[PDB]
Short mmCIF file of C-alpha atoms in Angstrom, two decimals:
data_model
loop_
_atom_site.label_atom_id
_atom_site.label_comp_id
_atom_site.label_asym_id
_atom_site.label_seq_id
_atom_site.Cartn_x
_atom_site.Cartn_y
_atom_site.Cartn_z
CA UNK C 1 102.42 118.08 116.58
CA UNK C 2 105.19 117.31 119.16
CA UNK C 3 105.83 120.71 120.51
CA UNK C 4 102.93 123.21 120.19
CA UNK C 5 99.54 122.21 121.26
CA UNK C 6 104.06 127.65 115.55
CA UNK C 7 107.22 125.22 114.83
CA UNK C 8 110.77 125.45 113.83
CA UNK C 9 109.83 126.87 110.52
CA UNK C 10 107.13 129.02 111.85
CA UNK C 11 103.22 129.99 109.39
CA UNK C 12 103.40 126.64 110.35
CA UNK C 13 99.86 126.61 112.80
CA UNK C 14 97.23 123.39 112.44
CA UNK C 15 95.62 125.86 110.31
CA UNK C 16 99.11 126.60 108.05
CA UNK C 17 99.70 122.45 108.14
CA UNK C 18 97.15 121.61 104.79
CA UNK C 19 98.84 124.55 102.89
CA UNK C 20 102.16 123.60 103.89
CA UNK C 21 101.54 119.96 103.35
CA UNK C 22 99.57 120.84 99.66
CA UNK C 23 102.39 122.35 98.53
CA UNK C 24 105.36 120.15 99.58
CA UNK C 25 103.13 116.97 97.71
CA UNK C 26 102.92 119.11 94.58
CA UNK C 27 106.43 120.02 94.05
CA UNK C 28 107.24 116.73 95.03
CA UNK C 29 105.33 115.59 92.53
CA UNK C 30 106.45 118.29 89.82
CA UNK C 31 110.75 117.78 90.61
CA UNK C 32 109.64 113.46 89.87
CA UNK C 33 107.90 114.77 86.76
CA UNK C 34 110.97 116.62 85.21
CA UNK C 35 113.41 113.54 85.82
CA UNK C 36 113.34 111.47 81.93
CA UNK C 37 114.73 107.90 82.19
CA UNK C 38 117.71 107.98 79.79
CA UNK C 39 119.44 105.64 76.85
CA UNK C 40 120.97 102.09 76.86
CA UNK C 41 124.01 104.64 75.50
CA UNK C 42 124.18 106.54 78.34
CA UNK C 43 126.67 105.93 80.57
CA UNK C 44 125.86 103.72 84.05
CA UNK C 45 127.11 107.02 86.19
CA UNK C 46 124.34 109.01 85.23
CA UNK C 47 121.44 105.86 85.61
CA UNK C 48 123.05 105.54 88.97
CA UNK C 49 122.19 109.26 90.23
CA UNK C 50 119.30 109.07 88.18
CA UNK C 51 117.84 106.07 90.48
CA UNK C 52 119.40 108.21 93.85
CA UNK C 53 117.23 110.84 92.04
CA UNK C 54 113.78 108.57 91.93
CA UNK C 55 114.78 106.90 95.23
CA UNK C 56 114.90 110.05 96.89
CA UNK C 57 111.92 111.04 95.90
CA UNK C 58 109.80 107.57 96.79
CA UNK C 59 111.30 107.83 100.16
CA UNK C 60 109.97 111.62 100.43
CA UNK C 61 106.86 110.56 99.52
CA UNK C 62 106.63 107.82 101.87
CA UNK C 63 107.62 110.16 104.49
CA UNK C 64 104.79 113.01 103.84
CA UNK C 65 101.99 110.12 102.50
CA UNK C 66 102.76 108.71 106.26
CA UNK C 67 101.31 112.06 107.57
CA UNK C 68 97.84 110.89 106.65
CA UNK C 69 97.51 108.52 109.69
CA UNK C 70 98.55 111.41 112.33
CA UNK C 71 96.51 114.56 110.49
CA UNK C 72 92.99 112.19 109.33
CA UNK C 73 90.52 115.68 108.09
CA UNK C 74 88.64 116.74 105.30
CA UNK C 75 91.46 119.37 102.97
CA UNK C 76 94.58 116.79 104.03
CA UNK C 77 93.21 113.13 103.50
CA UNK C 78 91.70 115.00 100.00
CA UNK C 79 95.70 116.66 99.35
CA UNK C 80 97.48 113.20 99.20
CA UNK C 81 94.50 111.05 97.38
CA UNK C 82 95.00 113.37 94.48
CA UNK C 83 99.10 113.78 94.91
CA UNK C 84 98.85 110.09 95.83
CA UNK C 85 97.91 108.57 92.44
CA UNK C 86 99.40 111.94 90.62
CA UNK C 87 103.18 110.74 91.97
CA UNK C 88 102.71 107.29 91.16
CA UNK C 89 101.45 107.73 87.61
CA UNK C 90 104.47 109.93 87.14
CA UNK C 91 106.73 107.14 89.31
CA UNK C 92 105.28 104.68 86.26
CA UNK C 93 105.99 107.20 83.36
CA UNK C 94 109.38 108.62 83.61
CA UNK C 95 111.46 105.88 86.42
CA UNK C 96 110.14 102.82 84.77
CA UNK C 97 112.13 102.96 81.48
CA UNK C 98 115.26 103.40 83.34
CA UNK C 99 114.60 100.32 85.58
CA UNK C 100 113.95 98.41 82.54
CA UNK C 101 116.98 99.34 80.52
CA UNK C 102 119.40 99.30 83.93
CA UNK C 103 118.24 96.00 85.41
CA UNK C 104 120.13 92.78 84.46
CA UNK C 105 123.27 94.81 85.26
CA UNK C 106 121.60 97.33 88.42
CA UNK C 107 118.84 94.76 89.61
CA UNK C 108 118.77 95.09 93.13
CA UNK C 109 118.13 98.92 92.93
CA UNK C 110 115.77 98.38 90.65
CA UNK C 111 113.75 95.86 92.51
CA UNK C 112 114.35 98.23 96.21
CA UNK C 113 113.18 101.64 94.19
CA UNK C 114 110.27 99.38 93.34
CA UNK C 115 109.66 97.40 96.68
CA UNK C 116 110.39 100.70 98.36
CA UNK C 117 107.77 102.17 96.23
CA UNK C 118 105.29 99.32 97.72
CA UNK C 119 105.47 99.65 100.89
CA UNK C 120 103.93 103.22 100.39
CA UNK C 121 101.23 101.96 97.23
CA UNK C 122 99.93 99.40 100.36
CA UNK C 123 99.30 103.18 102.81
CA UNK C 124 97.75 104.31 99.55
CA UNK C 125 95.54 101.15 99.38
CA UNK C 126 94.74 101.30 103.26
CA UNK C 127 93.85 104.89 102.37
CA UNK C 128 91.61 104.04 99.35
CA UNK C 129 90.33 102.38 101.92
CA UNK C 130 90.25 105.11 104.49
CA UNK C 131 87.64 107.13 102.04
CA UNK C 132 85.60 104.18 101.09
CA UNK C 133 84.66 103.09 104.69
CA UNK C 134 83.85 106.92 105.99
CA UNK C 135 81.74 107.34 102.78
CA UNK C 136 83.12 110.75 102.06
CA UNK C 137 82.07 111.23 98.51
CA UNK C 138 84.84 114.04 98.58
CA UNK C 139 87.74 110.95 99.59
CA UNK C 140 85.67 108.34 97.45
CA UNK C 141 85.85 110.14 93.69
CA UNK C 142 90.01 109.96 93.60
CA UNK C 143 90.00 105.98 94.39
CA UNK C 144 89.13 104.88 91.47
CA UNK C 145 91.96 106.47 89.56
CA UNK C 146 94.42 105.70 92.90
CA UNK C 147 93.40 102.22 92.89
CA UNK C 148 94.16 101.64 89.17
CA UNK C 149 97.39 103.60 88.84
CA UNK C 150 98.43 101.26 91.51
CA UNK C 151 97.04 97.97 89.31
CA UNK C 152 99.08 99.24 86.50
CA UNK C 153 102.23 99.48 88.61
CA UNK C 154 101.53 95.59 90.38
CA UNK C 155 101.02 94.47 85.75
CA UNK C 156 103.94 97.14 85.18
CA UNK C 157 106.56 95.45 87.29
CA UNK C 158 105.37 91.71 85.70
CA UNK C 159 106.51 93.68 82.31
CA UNK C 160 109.40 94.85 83.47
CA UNK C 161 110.31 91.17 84.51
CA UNK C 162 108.81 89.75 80.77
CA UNK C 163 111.15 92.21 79.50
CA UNK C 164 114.39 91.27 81.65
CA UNK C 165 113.47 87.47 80.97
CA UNK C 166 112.36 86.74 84.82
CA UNK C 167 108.74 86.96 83.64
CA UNK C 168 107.86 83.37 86.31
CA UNK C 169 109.72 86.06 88.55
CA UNK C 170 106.34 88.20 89.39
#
């Protein structure tokens, strides 16, 4: 966007930006799907680099979801609606486990993976927002499904805290 009105990584044209940016969502989404939250047996090392793991990849997909405000258009804004809800669900699945086994020792990780994951679920909620306001029936059918992955996550993290015995806490 900066430099050409073609990049440093060139087949990377306005034209070569929705492939580029499909792809990078879905393999995003695919290396968050392959990481399993682990045992209370387990040894704190490996919940540690497992949580650098998950952290790494919230704050990647903060990073790409934040492309929606700059590149608003039909193939793009319908890319991260679907990899959108389809990273969260898999940010509920297979991190959410681990924060409940590893919190009254690692809490403050815990509660920044998940506070850090917030701050992106609100762009997400602007955005389900985004394709309710343009009626774009195209936007408007992966909200409902966006919208409730990120209800489970706001009821998730109150049973996390029932859990961890901070259930006033939420």
């Amino acid at each position: 966007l900066i430099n050409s009105p073609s990049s440093t990584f060139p087949t990377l044209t306005r034209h070569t930006f929705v492939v580029f940016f499909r792809v990078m969502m879905a393999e995003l989404e695919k290396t968050v799907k392959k990481i399993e939250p682990g045992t209370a047996a387990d040894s704190q090392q490996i919940h540690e680099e497992k949580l650098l793991y998950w952290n790494m990849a919230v704050r990647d997909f903060s990073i790409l979801i934040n492309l929606i405000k700059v590149f608003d258009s039909h193939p793009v804004l319908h890319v991260c609606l679907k990899y959108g809800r389809l990273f969260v669900e898999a940010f509920l699945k297979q991190c959410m486990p681990l924060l409940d086994f590893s919190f009254r020792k690692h809490r403050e990780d815990v509660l920044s993976l998940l506070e850090t994951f917030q701050l992106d679920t609100r762009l997400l909620h602007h955005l389900c927002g985004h394709s309710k306001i343009h009626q774009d029936t195209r936007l408007t059918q992966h909200v409902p499904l966006l919208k409730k992955t990120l209800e489970l996550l706001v009821c998730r993290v109150k049973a996390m805290l029932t859990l961890n015995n901070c259930r006033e806490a939420f």
